[PDB]
Design an enzyme around this catalytic site. Structure first.
Site, PDB file in Angstrom:
ATOM      1  N   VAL A 298       0.827  -1.213   0.000  1.00  0.00           N
ATOM      2  CA  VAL A 298       0.000   0.000   0.000  1.00  0.00           C
ATOM      3  C   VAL A 298       0.865   1.269   0.000  1.00  0.00           C
ATOM      4  CG1 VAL A 298      -1.938   1.200   1.093  1.00  0.00           C
ATOM      5  CG2 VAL A 298      -1.765  -1.257   1.277  1.00  0.00           C
TER       6      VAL A 298
ATOM      7  N   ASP B  62      15.800   0.587   8.022  1.00  0.00           N
ATOM      8  CA  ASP B  62      17.180   0.725   8.504  1.00  0.00           C
ATOM      9  C   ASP B  62      17.540   2.165   8.805  1.00  0.00           C
ATOM     10  OD1 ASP B  62      17.829  -2.040   8.408  1.00  0.00           O
ATOM     11  OD2 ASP B  62      18.042  -1.843   6.163  1.00  0.00           O
TER      12      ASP B  62
ATOM     13  N   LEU C 137      10.539   2.573  13.202  1.00  0.00           N
ATOM     14  CA  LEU C 137       9.296   3.145  13.710  1.00  0.00           C
ATOM     15  C   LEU C 137       8.866   2.676  15.094  1.00  0.00           C
ATOM     16  CD1 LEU C 137       7.293   3.269  10.390  1.00  0.00           C
ATOM     17  CD2 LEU C 137       8.552   5.088  11.476  1.00  0.00           C
TER      18      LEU C 137
ATOM     19  N   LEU D 130      -4.339   4.027   7.717  1.00  0.00           N
ATOM     20  CA  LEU D 130      -4.884   2.916   6.933  1.00  0.00           C
ATOM     21  C   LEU D 130      -5.233   1.767   7.843  1.00  0.00           C
ATOM     22  CD1 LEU D 130      -2.351   3.011   4.089  1.00  0.00           C
ATOM     23  CD2 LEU D 130      -4.654   3.855   4.084  1.00  0.00           C
TER      24      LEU D 130
ATOM     25  N   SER E 214      -8.097  -1.687   8.271  1.00  0.00           N
ATOM     26  CA  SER E 214      -8.271  -2.965   7.602  1.00  0.00           C
ATOM     27  C   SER E 214      -9.718  -3.433   7.737  1.00  0.00           C
ATOM     28  CB  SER E 214      -7.319  -3.980   8.240  1.00  0.00           C
ATOM     29  OG  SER E 214      -7.337  -5.204   7.554  1.00  0.00           O
ATOM     30  N   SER E 215     -10.165  -4.277   6.805  1.00  0.00           N
ATOM     31  CA  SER E 215     -11.531  -4.780   6.809  1.00  0.00           C
ATOM     32  C   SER E 215     -11.751  -5.864   7.852  1.00  0.00           C
ATOM     33  CB  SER E 215     -11.917  -5.293   5.427  1.00  0.00           C
ATOM     34  OG  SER E 215     -11.025  -6.303   5.004  1.00  0.00           O
ATOM     35  N   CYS E 216     -10.670  -6.528   8.246  1.00  0.00           N
ATOM     36  CA  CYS E 216     -10.754  -7.592   9.244  1.00  0.00           C
ATOM     37  C   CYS E 216     -10.955  -7.045  10.659  1.00  0.00           C
ATOM     38  CB  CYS E 216      -9.531  -8.523   9.146  1.00  0.00           C
ATOM     39  SG  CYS E 216      -7.914  -7.714   9.135  1.00  0.00           S
TER      40      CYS E 216
ATOM     41  N   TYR F 202      -4.360  -8.207  15.860  1.00  0.00           N
ATOM     42  CA  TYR F 202      -4.123  -7.218  14.812  1.00  0.00           C
ATOM     43  C   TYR F 202      -5.279  -6.211  14.733  1.00  0.00           C
ATOM     44  CZ  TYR F 202      -3.465  -5.458   9.973  1.00  0.00           C
ATOM     45  OH  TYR F 202      -3.268  -4.685   8.849  1.00  0.00           O
TER      46      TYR F 202
ATOM     47  N   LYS G 145      -5.350  -2.069  15.296  1.00  0.00           N
ATOM     48  CA  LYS G 145      -5.896  -1.208  14.258  1.00  0.00           C
ATOM     49  C   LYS G 145      -7.033  -0.297  14.754  1.00  0.00           C
ATOM     50  CE  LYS G 145      -3.337  -1.865  10.712  1.00  0.00           C
ATOM     51  NZ  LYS G 145      -2.711  -0.697  10.038  1.00  0.00           N
TER      52      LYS G 145
ATOM     53  N   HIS H 144      -3.541 -15.113   1.444  1.00  0.00           N
ATOM     54  CA  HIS H 144      -4.492 -14.256   0.731  1.00  0.00           C
ATOM     55  C   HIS H 144      -4.797 -14.907  -0.603  1.00  0.00           C
ATOM     56  CE1 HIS H 144      -2.937 -11.085   3.609  1.00  0.00           C
ATOM     57  NE2 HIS H 144      -4.184 -11.348   3.954  1.00  0.00           N
TER      58      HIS H 144
ATOM     59  N   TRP I 215     -10.100 -25.720  -1.882  1.00  0.00           N
ATOM     60  CA  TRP I 215     -10.929 -26.119  -0.740  1.00  0.00           C
ATOM     61  C   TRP I 215     -12.216 -25.296  -0.683  1.00  0.00           C
ATOM     62  CZ3 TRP I 215      -8.685 -30.146  -0.885  1.00  0.00           C
ATOM     63  CH2 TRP I 215      -7.471 -30.525  -0.266  1.00  0.00           C
TER      64      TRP I 215
END
Ligand code: NAP
Ligand code: NAP
Lengths: 317, 317
Positions: free
Chosen positions: B13, B35, B39, B103, B105-107, B134, B138, B177, B200
Site C-alpha cells: 500500500v 534501517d 518506527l 490505513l 483494515s476490513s478484518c 491485529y 488497528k 491471501h 478447498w
C-alpha cells in the site's frame, strides 16, 4: 551398471530411496521383502550376499516405532536392530561389498545436547529414556561401520536424519510423531467440523523437520560422494553426517501451518497446563552443506504434498 | 510545496501511494527505510519529526501477515502495530503535523457483521479469532486519531480498505491471501500442465476485492478533501471511511477468472468436503461514493495487470 541392495525398501525411508534410484538406468536394484529374506537370520543374509553380486547397500531396514512402542517393547527394539545391523554389515564385508550407507537417527544424541547439535555431540551425555534401547542399537551400528572402515579399509558411511515426514509414514492413530498425528487429527476435525483442536503444551518448543524425499536425495548424495572428499570432511571415529534443514519452527507454527494446509477453519488451542519437551532440538548441518547438499522441500510445500498423498491412501489407516 | 511522509513506503500500500504522489511536483516526499528509521523507537521517531518539516503523513507502515502468521505471532502483531501507531501519531502532533491518514483494515469489523458492512458496524460484536490481536491494534489506531482530533483539533483521517491485491503483494507460497495464492498456483499448474487444480470449499462464498492502485487513489482523495467536506460526511467518534468496490463475487468466479487470465486449460475443482468461511463479506461504500470517489479498476483488468507484474518479478518469490 551398479547393483544396489536397498534393505527395507518397503519402509518410509527405504521406499523414498528406491523411488529415486528407480529413475535412473545406471543402477540395477536388488530387492527382497521380509518374506523373501528375513534380515534377522544370519545364514539367510550371508547366503543372499553370496548368491547375488551386490555393489552397494542402503541399510534402511529397522524396527521403528513411537513413544508407546519404544517403552513397551524395549527388548525387541534393541535386539532386532542390533541383529539386522550386524548381519548385513558383516555379510557385506564377507562378500566384498565395499560401499554401504547406514541410516541412523536424531534421537541418538544426548537428551541435553548443545543446540544446534553437531556430529561431535554423539556420546556426550545421557540419552532420552524413551529412546535408549533403540539409540544404543543405532550407535552400535555407526561404530560397526567405523570399525570395518578402520580394520578392513571399507567404505561404510552413515547419515543421521532429523525428524522425517512424507508419504508412507505411519498415519495410524497409534503414531506419536507430530506431523502424521496432526495431519490426521486436523483432517478429521475439519471433516467433523469440530469448533477446536486441543494440543498438549504451550506450542513454544522448537523442532526441525525434513521431508523424506529430501532425506533420500541427501543419502544418495553422501553415498555417491568421492571417497577422498568424504574422508576429508569426516574423521575415522566420528564419521556420521547430520542430515536436516538447520531451520527450526515452533510447534505452534507447525500446527497452524497444518491447519491451513488441511483447510481447517476451527481454532487451534494449546493447553499449557501440560508439560513441554526440551525447548529446542535441531541439527547442525554445516558438514552436510560443506559437502554441497542443500534441502529443496520447504515445510508448507512438503506438508501440502504429504496431505495429498494421505488423501489418496487413507483407506490403509 | 507540501512535504509528505509516507511511512512504510516499501510495502504494498505504501509503495502504491508513493507511485502516485511521485507523479506530481506540488508534493515533496520524505521517505525513510526501516534501517534509516525504526518506527518502533519512540525517540528515533520524535527526533525525525523534530528534524524534518512534515506537512502530511500517510501511515502505511504495519506488521502484516496471513492466517498462519497472525495465529503464530499474536504478540508481535498487536505490540508492533500499537507502537508504530502511537509513536507516529504522537510525534506528528508534538511537532505540529496537522494532517495524517491512517490505513486500517476490513478484518477489523465483527465476524458476524451485517452485510454490506457500514462504518457503524465497528465494535458491534466479537472479532474473528485469527485476526483479533491485529484488529485491536488497528481499532486503537483509529481511536487515537479521533481522540487527537477531538482534544487538539487535529485532522487525522482514516480509511478502511477491503481485500487488496496488485503489485508488491506477497506472492510467496506462505501467503494465505486468496488472489496472490491463486495467481501463483494457477501459474505453476499451467506451467507443469496439471490436469486440475483443487481448491478447498464450495466456491459459493462471496468476497470483495480492490486493486491497490485504486486504494492509493482513494486514500489521496480522502486525505486531500476539504476539512469541512470531511466533517460533514463523518462523525467525531465514527470517522473512518470504507474503501472498496461495493461489488462482490464468488470464490468460484474469482478462481475461474484467474484461470482464464493465466491461460490455464485444466479443470478448476472445488472440494466441497472442506468448510467455507462466512457466506458473504463486503463493505458498504456509500460514504466514500458520496465523497465523490469511485474505483476504476475492474477485477479482470486488475488480475491481468497484476499477473503481468508477477511475471516480470517472479525471481523474488
Ligand atoms: N528422526 C529420525 O532420526 C528418523 C526418522 C525416521 C526414520 N529414520 C531412520 O530411517 C530408518 C528407517 O525408518 P522408517 O521410518 O523408514 O521405518 P519403516 O517404514 O518401518 O521401515 C523399516 C523397514 O524395514 C523392514 N524390516 C524390519 N525388520 C525386517 C526384517 N527382519 N527382515 C526384513 N525386513 C525387515 C520393514 O518391513 P516390514 O514392515 O514389511 O516388516 C520396513 O519396510 C530408521 O531406523 C532410522 O534410522 C530416522
Ligand atoms: N484487507 C485489508 O483491510 C487490507 C489489506 C492489505 C493492506 N491493508 C492495510 O494496509 C496496511 C499496510 O499493508 P501492506 O499490505 O502494504 O503491508 P506491507 O507490504 O508489509 O507494508 C508494511 C511496510 O511497513 C514497514 N515497516 C514495518 N515495521 C516497520 C518498522 N518498525 N520500521 C520501519 N518500517 C516498518 C515494512 O517494511 P519492511 O518490510 O522493510 O520491514 C513494510 O514496507 C495494513 O496494516 C492495513 O491497514 C488492509
Amino acid at each position: 551398471k551398479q547393483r544396489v541392495f536397498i534393505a527395507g525398501h518397503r519402509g518410509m525411508v527405504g521406499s523414498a530411496i528406491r523411488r529415486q534410484l528407480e529413475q535412473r538406468g545406471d543402477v540395477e536394484l536388488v530387492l527382497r521383502t521380509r518374506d523373501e529374506l528375513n534380515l534377522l537370520d544370519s545364514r539367510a543374509v550371508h547366503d543372499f550376499f553370496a548368491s547375488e553380486r551386490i555393489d552397494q547397500v542402503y541399510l534402511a531396514a529397522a524396527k521403528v516405532g513411537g513413544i508407546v512402542a519404544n517403552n513397551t517393547y524395549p527388548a525387541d527394539f534393541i535386539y532386532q536392530n542390533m541383529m539386522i545391523e550386524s548381519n548385513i554389515i558383516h555379510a557385506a564385508h564377507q562378500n566384498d561389498v565395499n560401499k554401504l550407507l547406514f541410516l541412523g537417527s536424531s534421537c541418538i544424541y544426548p537428551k541435553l545436547a548443545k543446540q544446534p547439535m553437531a556430529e561431535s555431540e554423539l556420546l556426550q551425555g545421557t540419552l532420552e529414556p524413551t529412546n535408549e534401547p533403540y539409540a544404543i542399537a543405532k550407535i552400535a551400528g555407526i561404530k560397526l561401520c567405523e570399525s570395518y572402515n578402520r580394520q578392513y579399509g571399507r567404505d561404510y558411511r552413515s547419515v543421521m536424519p532429523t525428524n522425517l515426514y512424507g508419504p508412507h509414514d505411519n498415519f495410524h492413530p497409534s503414531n506419536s510423531h507430530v506431523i502424521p498425528a496432526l495431519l490426521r487429527r486436523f483432517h478429521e476435525a475439519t471433516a467433523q467440523n469440530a469448533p477446536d483442536v486441543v494440543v498438549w503444551g504451550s506450542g513454544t518448543p522448537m523442532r526441525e523437520f525434513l521431508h523424506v524425499d529430501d532425506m533420500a536425495a541427501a543419502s544418495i548424495h553422501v553415498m555417491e560422494l568421492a571417497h577422498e572428499v568424504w574422508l576429508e570432511n569426516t574423521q575415522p571415529m566420528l564419521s556420521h553426517i547430520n542430515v536436516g534443514t538447520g531451520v527450526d519452527c515452533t510447534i505452534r507454527e507447525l500446527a497452524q501451518t497444518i491447519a491451513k494446509v488441511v483447510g481447517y477453519k476451527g481454532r487451534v488451542v494449546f493447553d499449557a497446563s501440560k508439560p513441554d519437551g526440551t525447548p529446542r532440538k535441531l541439527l547442525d548441518v554445516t558438514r552436510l552443506h560443506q559437502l554441497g547438499w542443500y534441502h529443496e522441500i520447504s515445510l508448507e510445500a512438503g506438508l501440502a504434498s504429504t496431505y495429498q498423498w494421505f488423501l489418496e491412501n487413507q483407506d490403509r489407516f
